[PDB]
Ligand binder design. Sequence first.
Ligand SMILES: O=C(O)c1cc(=O)cc(C(=O)O)o1
Ligand SMILES: O=C(O)c1cc(=O)cc(C(=O)O)o1
Lengths: 491, 500
Amino acid sequence: FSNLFARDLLPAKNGEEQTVQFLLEVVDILLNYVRKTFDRSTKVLDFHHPHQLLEGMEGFNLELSDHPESLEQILVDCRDTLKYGVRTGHPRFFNQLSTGLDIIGLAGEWLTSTANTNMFTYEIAPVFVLMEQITLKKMREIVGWSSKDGDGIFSPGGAISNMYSIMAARYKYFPEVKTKGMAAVPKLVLFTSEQSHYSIKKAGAALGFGTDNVILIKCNERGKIIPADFEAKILEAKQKGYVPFYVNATAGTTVYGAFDPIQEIADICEKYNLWLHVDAAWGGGLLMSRKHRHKLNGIERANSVTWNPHKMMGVLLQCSAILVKEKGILQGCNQMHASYLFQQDKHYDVSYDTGDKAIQCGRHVDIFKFWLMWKAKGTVGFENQINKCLELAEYLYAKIKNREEFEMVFNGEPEHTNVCFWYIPQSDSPQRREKLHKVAPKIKALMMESGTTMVGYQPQGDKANFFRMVISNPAATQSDIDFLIEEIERL
Amino acid sequence: TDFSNLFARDLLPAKNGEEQTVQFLLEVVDILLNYVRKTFDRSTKVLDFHHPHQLLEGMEGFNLELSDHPESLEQILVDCRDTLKYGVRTGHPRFFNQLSTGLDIIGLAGEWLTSTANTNMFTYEIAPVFVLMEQITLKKMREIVGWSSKDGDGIFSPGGAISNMYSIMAARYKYFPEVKTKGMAAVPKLVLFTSEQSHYSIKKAGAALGFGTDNVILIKCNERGKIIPADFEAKILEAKQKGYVPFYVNATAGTTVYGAFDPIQEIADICEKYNLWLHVDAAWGGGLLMSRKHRHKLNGIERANSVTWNPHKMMGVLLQCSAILVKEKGILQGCNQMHASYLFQQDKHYDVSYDTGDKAIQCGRHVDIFKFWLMWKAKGTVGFENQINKCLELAEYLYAKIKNREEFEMVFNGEPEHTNVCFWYIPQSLRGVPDSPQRREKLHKVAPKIKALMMESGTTMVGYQPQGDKANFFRMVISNPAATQSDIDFLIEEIERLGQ
Ligand SMILES: O=C(O)c1cc(=O)cc(C(=O)O)o1
Ligand SMILES: O=C(O)c1cc(=O)cc(C(=O)O)o1
C-alpha cells in the first residue's frame, strides 16, 4: 500500500479488492482504538500544545500538498490522528456533557456514512425520512404531548434547535416579520434563565431581536428560575410598551444541572400568552427514566422542546431535535414557497420533504445511529443506563458533601449528574475567592499533563472557578468516580 | 459468530464483552463492504423504489417501529442490511439526481475514523488535531480563492445554506454592529440583493435574520442565467431613493439549475462604488477553483468579502462539508461571541486563541474536517483537479451529444459553464410542433412521466424542474468520479427509451 494511491481504489476499474483491503486496514486501526477506549491503562489524552503539532510530531505532517500521499501514509495519518486526539469514550473522560462511545451508535454512524445521502427529500433518503418521523413521534409521546398535533426536525446541534424554537414562536405571533422584517412589528422580548445556555442570547442576536431584548430571569440558590421574577419581567416589558412572547425554561442547566419549574412557568405563559420552549438538551435523557422524568413535569404543556440524544442518551455527535407541539409552524415559518405546489408531478408524496420547514437546505443523516440504538437497547436500555449515571452522581455528591478538602458551590441536592464543587487548598473572604479561583485551573493543567482524567471547571456570577463533574458515560463506574475524587485531592 | 441471543447491553462497556464487540463491528463492516462493492456495479439498482406505506407497513421483516424492549444483535444486523437495501445508491455511476453524489473511499474511511473519535469542534482541549487541520485547510482555501496567506478567516458549517446565513450576519455586523444588542428595528430598512436564479438560502436567511423577504431584492438574469449588472446598479439606486440602506449582494458562482456564473468583476465594481459587502456563493462552483482550466469562471472572487464553498459538492466530500470564508479576520468572532464561561475559559493551560467555538452560530459542532483533509492528503490538489476536469469534460460530451439532436431541446442558448446540462426530451408528437402555450403545457408532463418510469426500473435518476415560464426540464449534473461516458450514453438512451 506504500506504492498504492487513492486514484487506484474504486471508482477506478478493477479496484474492488484493494478498496476492501484498504477499508479493513482502516477498520483494524479503529478496532484497536475502540478496544483501548475501554482500557483504563490508556491515557484519556496525550496532551500537546498547538505549536508542538504545527511544527510537527515525529512523522506527522498536517500540511497539504499538490501531490497525493500513498495509501500506507494515509493509514499512518489515521493512526496518528487517533494517537493525538482525546479518548471521549474513556471511562475517565468527564470533561463534557457528551461522553462515552456507544458501539451500536458507532455502527450506526459507519452505516450512515456508507449511505451518504441528504435528509431533505424522501426521494434520496426514503428510509431515513421515515425513521425520523417515527422517532420524532415517540419523542413527542414521551414528552407527554397528545397525538392530535405535533411536529419536529433534527438539527445540527441544540443551539440551532433553540434558534428554531424562537423562529417558530415569532412566526406564530408575528408572521409579518418573515416578509416585512423585525422593524414591521413592536419590540419583541424573550426570557431565559440567568443560568440558561448562551444559545438563547446568540439566536436573539442572529434573528434580529438584539441581545438587549433577551431578558435574564433571576435564579434561586439551586440555580432554578424564580417564577415571580419571570412574571415581574413580563409586566415590566408590557409597561414599557414592549411585546413579551417567548420563554426558554431550562430542563437541566449546563453547569448546576438545575431544572426550571416548568409548571409554574407554563401557568404564567398561559396567563400572559407566551410561547413556552423547554431546553431539555441536557435534561431530556431523564424523560426516558420513570424514576427521574418528574424533574421535567410541565413539559407536556410546552410549545416546543430542544432535546439532545447526543448528551445523556449517548448517541454519537450530533443528534438534536426540536419538537414543536403545533404542526405547520416550522413549515409556515421556513417555506420560501407555500403548499403542495411541488405536486402533482412528483412520483412520491412531497409532504415528506423537509427542505421547506428547515433553515438548512442540505441536511446530514443523524437519525439512523439514534434509531439503531433505540432498536438495540429499547426504552428500557436507555432507562437503566441514565439511572446508573444519576446513581453514580448521587454517590459522588454524598462522598464529598462534607469532605474537608471539598466545598459545595450551592446549597441543594443535584437534580442531574452535575456535581459542582471546589477543591480547597487549606481554608468566605474576597481575598480567599482570589486564592480559590486559581486552584481548579492548576489541577486541570496537571490533569491534562498526566492524562489520568478530564474534568471541566468554570466560574459563575461572583463564584470562583469551580469543578463541575458531570456523568453521561455508561463506561464510568463507582471506582472511576473514586479515582477522580482521589485524583483531585492528590493534585 | 452467533448473535441470536446477544444484546447491545452485553457489548463494551460491559466487562468481558470485548471479543463480541469486535465480532459484531466486523459483521456490520462486512455488510457495508458488500454494499460498497455493489455501489460501483452498474447492474445494481440506483434505488429500489417504495412508496412510504410499503416501508411503514413493514417490508418482510423490516420493522421501523420503536419499542420498550431490545432486539438481539442478529436482528440489528438484519435491520442494517435492510436499511441499505431500501436506500439510494448515491455513489452509483448512474445517479445524477443531485449536486452531491459519489462515494469517495478516502472520505468514507475519514468519516468512520471521525465517528470513532466522536468529538466536538468547539475547543482545542477536546479536538486538538481537528482544530489545527481545520486552520490549515481554511488557510489553503483562502489562498486558492486569491486572498492573502496571513489575513483571513472562516469556519466549517452544517451546510452551505448556513454558510450563506453567516455571510449576511457578518455583512450586517460589519456595517451595523448596533443590531447585535439593539435589534434590526434600531437601524434603517436594510436591503440585500441576489440573483433571480440564486439559491433560496438567501431569502430564508433574510426571513430568519429579521430583514424580511420583501427586503431580499431579486436581480434580473440574462438568457444565460447571469445577473445583468445594470439591473443591480438600478436596484441599489431604487432602495437608496426610498431611504433604504443597501449593504450586501450575493453573487452566485455556479447556480444549481443552469450552472451559470455571475459576473463577479462587474458586480464587485458596483459594490466598491456604493460601499456594499460582496459575498460569493461558490457552494456549487467552488470545486472549479481547483481546476487551472476552469477557475476563470470565478475571476473576481479575490475581491469578495466572503465565500461559501461546499467541498461536499464538486470535490466529492461526504455530506456535510461546507465552509464560509471571510476576508477580514475578527468579523466572525465579533458578530457571534457570547463569552460563555463554561466553554471558552480564558485562564486555560494552553493558548485559548485556538478555541474557535465562539465565532460560530453553533455550540456543539460535528467534525467535518477530517474526511476532507484526508481526501486532500490522498488526492493532492492534482487529484481534485483531475476529478473536477473529468466531470466537466463529461458535461461537455453530454451537451454536444444532445445539442443538435431532434429528440431533444436545449433550455437556454449557451455553453454550459458548470456540469449542469439543461434540456427537454421531445416526444415524436411534439416534433416539430411550433412553440405555443399549448405545446408548453403538453411538454411540462413529459419530464415527470419519464422520471416516474425511471423510478420503476431504478436504472438511473435525474432531476427535472421548471423555471419561470419554461415547462419542466431535465437538469443533468455530474459530480460523481464514478460516472463515465457510457453512463452518459445510457442516460440519453434511457430518457429516449422511456420517452417513447
Ligand atoms: O457537547 C458537549 O459535550 C457540551 C456542550 C455544552 O454546551 C457544554 C459542555 C460543557 O460545559 O462541558 O459540553
Ligand atoms: O447537496 C445536494 O445534493 C443538493 C443541494 C441543493 O441545494 C440542490 C440540489 C439539486 O437540485 O440537485 O442538490
